[PDB]
From a paper:
NiV has two membrane-anchored glycoproteins, the attachment protein (G, also known as RBP (receptor binding protein)) and fusion (F) protein, that mediate receptor binding and entry into host cells. NiV F initially exists as a homo-trimer on the viral surface, where it adopts a prefusion conformation. G/RBP binding to the cellular receptor, ephrin-B2 or -B3, triggers a conformational change in F that facilitates fusion of the viral and cellular membranes as F adopts the highly stable postfusion conformation.
Antibody 1A9 binds to an interface encompassing a large quaternary epitope spanning domains 1 and 2 on two adjacent protomers, burying 1302 Å2 on NiV F (1025 Å2 on one protomer, 277 Å2 on the other). The 1A9 interface comprises a variety of interactions, including six π − π stacking interactions and twelve hydrogen bonds. The stoichiometry of the NiV F complex with Fab 2D3 was 1:1 (Fab:NiV F trimer), while the other complexes were all 3:1 (Fab:NiV F trimer). Four antibodies recognize previously uncharacterized neutralization-sensitive epitopes on the lateral and basal surfaces of NiV F, located within domains 1 and 2.
Numbering used by the authors:
A (entry chain L), B (entry chain G), C (entry chain F): 1 to 107
D (entry chain B), E (entry chain D), F (entry chain A): 27 to 104, 112 to 471
G (entry chain E), H (entry chain H), I (entry chain C): 1 to 52, 52A, 53 to 82, 82A, 82B, 82C, 83 to 99, 101 to 113
Amino acid sequence: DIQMTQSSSSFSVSLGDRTTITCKASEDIYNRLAWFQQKPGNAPRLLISGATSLETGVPSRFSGSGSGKDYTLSITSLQTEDVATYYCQQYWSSPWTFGGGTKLEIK
Amino acid sequence: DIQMTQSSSSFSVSLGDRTTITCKASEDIYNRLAWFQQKPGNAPRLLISGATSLETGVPSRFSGSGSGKDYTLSITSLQTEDVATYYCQQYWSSPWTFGGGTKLEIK
Amino acid sequence: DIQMTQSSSSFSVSLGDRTTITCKASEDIYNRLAWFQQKPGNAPRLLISGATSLETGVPSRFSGSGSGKDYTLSITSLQTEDVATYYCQQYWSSPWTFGGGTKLEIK
Amino acid sequence: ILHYEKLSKIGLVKGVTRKYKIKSNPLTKDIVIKMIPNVSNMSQCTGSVMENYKTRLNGILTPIKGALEIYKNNTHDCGVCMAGVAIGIATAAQITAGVALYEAMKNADNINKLKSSIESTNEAVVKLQETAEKTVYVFTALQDYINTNLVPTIDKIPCKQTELSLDLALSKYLSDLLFVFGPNLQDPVSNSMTIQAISQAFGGNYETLLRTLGYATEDFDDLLESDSITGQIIYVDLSSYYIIVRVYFPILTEIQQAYIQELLPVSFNNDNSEWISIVPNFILVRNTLISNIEIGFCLITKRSVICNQDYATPMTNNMRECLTGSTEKCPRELVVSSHVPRFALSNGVLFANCISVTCQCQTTGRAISQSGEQTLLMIDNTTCPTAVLGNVIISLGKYLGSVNYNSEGIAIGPPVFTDKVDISSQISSMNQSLQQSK
Amino acid sequence: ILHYEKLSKIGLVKGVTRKYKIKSNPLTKDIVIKMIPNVSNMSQCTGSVMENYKTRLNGILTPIKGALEIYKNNTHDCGVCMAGVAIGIATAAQITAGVALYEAMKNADNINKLKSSIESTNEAVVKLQETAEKTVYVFTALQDYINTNLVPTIDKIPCKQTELSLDLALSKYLSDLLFVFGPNLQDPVSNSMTIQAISQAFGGNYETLLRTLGYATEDFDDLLESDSITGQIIYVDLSSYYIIVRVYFPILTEIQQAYIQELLPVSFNNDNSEWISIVPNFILVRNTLISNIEIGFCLITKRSVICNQDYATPMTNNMRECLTGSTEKCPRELVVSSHVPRFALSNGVLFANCISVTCQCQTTGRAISQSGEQTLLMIDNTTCPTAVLGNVIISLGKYLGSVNYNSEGIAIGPPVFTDKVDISSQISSMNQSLQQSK
Amino acid sequence: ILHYEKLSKIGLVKGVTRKYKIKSNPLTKDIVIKMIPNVSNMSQCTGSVMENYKTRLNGILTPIKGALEIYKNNTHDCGVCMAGVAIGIATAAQITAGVALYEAMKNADNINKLKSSIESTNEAVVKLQETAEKTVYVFTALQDYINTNLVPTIDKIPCKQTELSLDLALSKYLSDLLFVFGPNLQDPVSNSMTIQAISQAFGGNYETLLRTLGYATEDFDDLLESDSITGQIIYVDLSSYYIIVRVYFPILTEIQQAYIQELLPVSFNNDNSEWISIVPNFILVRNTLISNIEIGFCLITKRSVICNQDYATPMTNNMRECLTGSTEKCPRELVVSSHVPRFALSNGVLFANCISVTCQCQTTGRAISQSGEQTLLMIDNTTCPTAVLGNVIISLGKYLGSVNYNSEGIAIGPPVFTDKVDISSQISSMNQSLQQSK
Amino acid sequence: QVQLQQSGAELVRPGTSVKISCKASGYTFTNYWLGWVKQRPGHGLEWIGDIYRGGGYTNYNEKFKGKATLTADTSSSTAYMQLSSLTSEDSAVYFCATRDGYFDYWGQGTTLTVSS
Amino acid sequence: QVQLQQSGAELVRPGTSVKISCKASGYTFTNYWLGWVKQRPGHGLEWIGDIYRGGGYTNYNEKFKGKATLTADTSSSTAYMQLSSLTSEDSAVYFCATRDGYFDYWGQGTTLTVSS
Amino acid sequence: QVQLQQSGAELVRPGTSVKISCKASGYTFTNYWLGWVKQRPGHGLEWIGDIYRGGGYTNYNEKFKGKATLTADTSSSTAYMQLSSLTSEDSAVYFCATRDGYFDYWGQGTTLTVSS
């Protein structure tokens, strides 16, 4: 199985500052990555399909990037509505796995 | 060569009764059968092409059927014009072989 | 390489008579031959493309022929403008070679 | 019928008449195609290539089995009933194929009772016959290559090379297989899948399959090359990695009162120019009804045109009148090419465009000359017993039509351009002419 | 959207809806295909067959190399500058491919630093990894055949026969190669050349190439059979006789607010005759914009229509109005063929031409009769819980559309003939009608 | 000539000019293809598979021999007189092919004098030369497989497995053979059958055949891939199971004063929308006569378009005026596909649709803007020494045409839709418009 | 309307040869098989051989191969059956018949009597 | 508008089985994958298995294979997940989600509590 | 009208290099072979090598390989022949000629004289 590891279980970023969430795959998934945002009490909502392609309902401040095993979700200007848990999903191999989840917080 | 054997050289069937002529091939001919009616002094005329398909000029009372090696020509209502010798021809293997001929008669 | 040998370095043919220039290939070139006419002080000009096909500017008195290794350029009626050196070129093999050159002369 | 004299004057010299016969009444035989070879004799020199091959083949065959069990679980006896609510969306052909699949499932189960015997096969062709109920033939995809090459070379080459060769053979088999059994096979339910395509599960050897099944006849090649012998996958095993295929072997039933007439497109002369007539070269006439035929999909044989289904297509009334005598409604296209047919022979009678070819008569030595008002010349023994057209010298029969063929002129049709870009150009011109008139 | 009720009355029963996804964002891996085998283990009686093979392969590969240095010498860093004056004539795709070629040249040089290692390979698949900079896979064209057939049979046969077998294998490889890498490859710069064609330099074994590259995924077969996985030759060696190919492995991005709607062509009845509607069977709707799609070039899958390029093509306003409800603008063609689909199923509802097929209800026992004013019959559980169509018995769901479907008639479109000869005939007749009116 | 400036404004940027050359003057070499291998070295265990193979091959080859002896018995010396009455129906090409067949019969008899030597061949390639009269090469279909695999494995495997391998190899050979020599070969008399198709009697190895015949030349690949090298079966033996094939090796003569001009279809802007021009991309101009060419059947090479036949087809007067300057008569189609070409380069000059792509100049940093009244922008060094088109940075030459290219507008042609269903829709609409006007 | 007109009945001495003809008229299709069938009293129909008026080859029964010779004249659409070395057992009614696998149209039959 | 309506939260005794439903509505495409994802407190998202509505096959996580059973009803577009032999570690929020590789549209989540 | 204009005659000392040019003008076809032919007194035409203007490769005579170097400029449609290490036997008339197998159009010839 592809183990998907995020850098931190929680991040404290001030409002308006750039937020970076990184996720490392056990093997090369060839940009078969998805980024999901999940607020408490709600289902996950898709942010990034593939390494970079944004979902049509996602604001442009969410930017997907990555190569090989390393991937990064970036928020150029953090807002109060972006305070949620972010999950990285690989969809390269059959046993589909998610990241540990990065619970974003405000300082 | 495929030996084509008919049940009897002659049958005696009353007028109006159903007449059954059967023909057994030495091997499976896969519905590559023909039924011919030959009155004395005349050339044979095609009744059935394939196992079941009737010739366009043949009355509907002639019915062809068969499976494997065994085939059957049926006359649902025997008439006076149906008193003739009936031949089964196989055209599966290269030497084309006819049956022994069934000289139909009236009781 | 394909050595292209012409019969004589020079011929003396009277005006109006038929002139025959022959060229022998070391191997079969399959009609991949060209005939060129070169007057002194001028570049060679193509006469025959292939064994027989004339260049569009060439008079019909120049006739190409040949088979296998042997090829022949014929002038049915020699004129004063046909006094030049004639070269056979093979274009069958990569090391492209010309004939020895037949310097045509008048008796 | 067709007005062959005026058509020949137009340059449509009538050819051979062919019977019309269509695939019908298919008989069914069930075969097993094991898509994995038996490497028991070289198992010590195999490695993990067989596990990777099993994973790849399972991934390939799983959608096929899923598409089958769309129709397995939604079809039941009643006498064959389907839950069309559960199926949802289907065509008539797919539903008929589902009926055939459910009919074949009983013999599929009878075969699957020989699952262990199918697994144990170590030859490319194995006949399994325990009782009369189970008389199936099993074909193994790469067994011959194993038994012939890899097993004899266990002790000759290092076994890593044997593993690499087995992997390469399996991967080449999968490369040949994926063109047919991959995502291209969206609908494995259908029984229109020909036996050549299914033979790709046996390395493209349909000859072995059909010769083993005992289909050798005079019409076998005609049924084979007309795509009439087709098969349907009726069972997929994801554990033993084999499929059960129901091969449909039909008979060629002739369509009565039907024939296909071939026309040979001879170029003809008009207005100091060369033309060819734009008509269908093959005309299907059934019960005196003239219609087109998509003969590209049919097999053309000297006796008959052989089709796997009825390819008759409608024909315009203008072309039907063209073929029945109205030569003024026959479209004609200019001849710019220098290699289009100049002449043709029919019943020993030669129809030639002697404007473009040097016709001359051997009997008299005189050149057969064509006037500017003649589209073609009919050359027969009444006017020329033996005609010469360049390098050919041909003796000619007598024309059975009008004796005044060469003196009777005809009306001519409108010029056309059949290039698809020029088709768009003419549509543009007609649309703009309509707008100007409107 | 499309007016599916009127279309179904016209016989265009709506099918499954499929996603629109196109190849995007390729990832690049560089491979070496050594086009000459290593015969070191059998060189004692190889003879001159390998020198002749070298000459033939050099003649084949020299034009490809020259076409590459058309763009090698005319492209440089500046950040990639193209010398368009020296190139002269090029297309956008060719220029982009040349830019990608010059981008790949750095990895080509890093690989070419392993020239001797590539030459020394004596297996069909060899991984060359001296450092992390140079981790290339080398595939040899006929190495497996040599190692497993000719080397083991050195002492078994008089190896002049081994020489002839080597020559025949090389010549067969060249025969399979010339269909792809011969003069057909006019533009080797382009990166649209699929991996199937490039695998002909490896004997057609693209499965080995793509499995070795580790491209195993659920979308692998979809990317493969849609011609989305393509490669580009980035280096040609005329001394060691190998090529470096940059394999492009893309991701199928889905076109948002886009879908392809499939229509099932059910024949329908009008004027005591049978008709089919001449409409596109696949309609691409993007952002509510109805357009055609060249789906012949795309891979059709149960979930999606998968394309390597945007094959959307324009659609006439009349056809768009046909699809949106104007059934009077829908062209229809006669049915002369007897194998037309008479019915289809959609959402458990059966749309049948009961004039041509004997519909009868199993629940009630009475035949489902169609009047002369009805094009088709919608059969659902409200009127027939279980319908029979001969060998087919099917249970039906409830129609979600109008309850008065079978009583509401529609306007019908003009008859057409779609044969290309009939197309020229109709152009002739319309042009002559214009001339008569003018 | 063509008005390349107005065409480029329409988006038809001129490409490379290619010569027109056609196959001519074929030279004939006769070869023997023995269609059965020699199994003498393993005769003790070939079983009955060879007799079955002989029966199947005789059934395959008997129609070919019958079709040949249709023309053998009806052709004789006069100086080649043909009995057209007995033949009945034939075409010009078929009659010419029969004459060539009768010409080849003398060499066929000279070869058949070596019938025993042909039977005795035990190698895949054998040169038979008793005297200068008989210098023929014999190619055996599966001899290499026998001598390389089956003979060495006689003692290695139970040679019942060798019988099975021989049978499978023969059946696979027949499977590959039947696509060409089966009922598809209705007319074996014709000499248009390419050497690739005939090589299927040798397992598809035409490279061995043509290298053995010594046809190595620079034009060999051009002749091969243009289908110019063709062969004709001149003799069929039903006892020894071999065929004599006359291989025709032609010379590519150039059509003088003829050239094919390629046009690159750049999309252009009009009415806030993108269009492509519906014109032929290849135009054949012979003696200043502009015409179409069926270039799909020809081989396209950087120097020339290479054809086995004169594929010139007529062009409408409206398209000829489009090409000569009447841009108002050039049909145009809408762009919905986002992947159609946006720009092209010709003679170092860039013709781009800067509405659709972000043109900018590297020299000045200013974006190259296109107005709404401009179809395309000509970008040259006078206005932009080096242009940037995203990932492409290109240096540009100077335009040799009008200096006021970007300020001189042109008339635009009518919109069209080229989909065949849309073609039927437009024919329907024009017909109904005619009926309304009438 | 298809008619296969055969030659009249022949009385032939033993040891000599007879050449029975069959002119097919009214047949729609250009190329077809034409078979010959023997019918003796006390025996069923016996197929002799097929001549192919399309491709130029023929099939023979192994019993009748060498005994019978099938030739065709495509100009007059007439095919012939040459029977050589006639004996008493060769006296039979001979039918020409076009076939497509099954014999379709039959001639009226030529009664051959071999006696001295 | 796509909505994946799931069944309400369930309180189930350990040792028994629960059958969670997910009725997909408003989905444009006929055939699709529908996946089930488990979310325990203190744990990330855990994929359970995929049911494929177009073709009759399904994928399971090897951890959840045998534990979960995925079935689908193509008439009402409702798929079900049968969880058998429930234990305390099965108490989690279960999401149904259509996926095209990546999970696209998610259900509101069925909170399953397993306690006695 | 096709003209292959060559550079004028050159008098070059032995041991140095000369670079003969040939500007083809009026040629209809974009891509072609352009060959160089040597002509010494008392000797026939000697082929030196061909530059292929379409694709980036060239053929050399094995005799002249290393002695001659063929380059081309596709902008002005001119080709060059660099002759290095000139000796007395290099004094000859050099013709550029477009070729299609056979040499079609010839330049006027550049007379090179190598003497001191």
